[PDB]
Swiss-Prot record:
Annotated Zn(2+) 1 binding sites: 50, 52, 110, 112
Domain of life according to the entry: Viruses
Function: Cysteine protease that cleaves viral polyprotein and specific host proteins. It is responsible for the autocatalytic cleavage between the P1 and P2 regions, which is the first cleavage occurring in the polyprotein. Also cleaves the host translation initiation factor EIF4G1, in order to shut down the capped cellular mRNA translation. Inhibits the host nucleus-cytoplasm protein and RNA trafficking by cleaving host members of the nuclear pores. Counteracts stress granule formation probably by antagonizing its assembly or promoting its dissassembly.
Annotated active site: 15, 33, 104
Catalytic activity: Selective cleavage of Tyr-|-Gly bond in the picornavirus polyprotein
Assembly and oligomerization: Homodimer.
Whole sequence portion shown: 869 to 1007 of 2193
Name of this chain's protein: Protease 2A
Length: 139
């Protein structure tokens, strides 16, 4: 689990969004596994607007942060799960690192701010949903 709180927005994995997230919906995209809802309190996070390919992410299954080298946001095949049919997920960045079910929502950050959140994993890989192109989160 996990979320990004920026301005008056909360960014979460679409498959983990709550009844409250859907009742306060701003935008969602099933092909990206993202959902953004509105908040009454001002957020704690700031968003990176960069092309970094290295960063540090939080891994809840190890209660630890790990450094990673990750690919540019791209279209990647994701096998069927109880949350989605087999499909191509867009704006996804892969890296070698630990992840297991429960790790979605962990934040990836570079020196410029928040880059994205854990969205996929397995086999010694971890996938992050990029949020750097969502310029409206800042305004
Ligand atoms: N973005 C998706 O389609 C997600 C939806 C939930 C299910 N997805 C997973 O990847 C679950 C998973 C499996 C094995 C792992 F080792 C792991 F870390 C994770 Br997270 C795809
Ligand atoms: Zn950066």
């Amino acid at each position: 689990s996990g979320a990004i709180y920026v301005g008056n927005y909360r960014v979460v994995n679409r498959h983990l969004a709550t009844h409250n997230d859907w009742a306060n919906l701003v935008w969602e995209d099933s092909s990206r596994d993202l959902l953004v809802s509105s908040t009454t309190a001002q957020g704690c996070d700031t968003i990176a607007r960069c092309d970094c390919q290295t960063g540090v992410y939080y891994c809840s299954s190890r209660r630890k942060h790990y450094p990673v080298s990750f690919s540019k946001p791209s279209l990647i095949f994701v096998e069927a799960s109880e949350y989605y049919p087999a499909r191509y997920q867009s704006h996804l960045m892969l890296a070698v690192g630990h992840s297991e079910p429960g790790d979605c929502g962990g934040i990836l950050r570079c020196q410029h701010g928040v880059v994205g959140i854990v969205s996929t994993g397995g086999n010694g890989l971890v996938g992050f949903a990029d949020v750097r192109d969502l310029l409206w989160l800042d305004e």
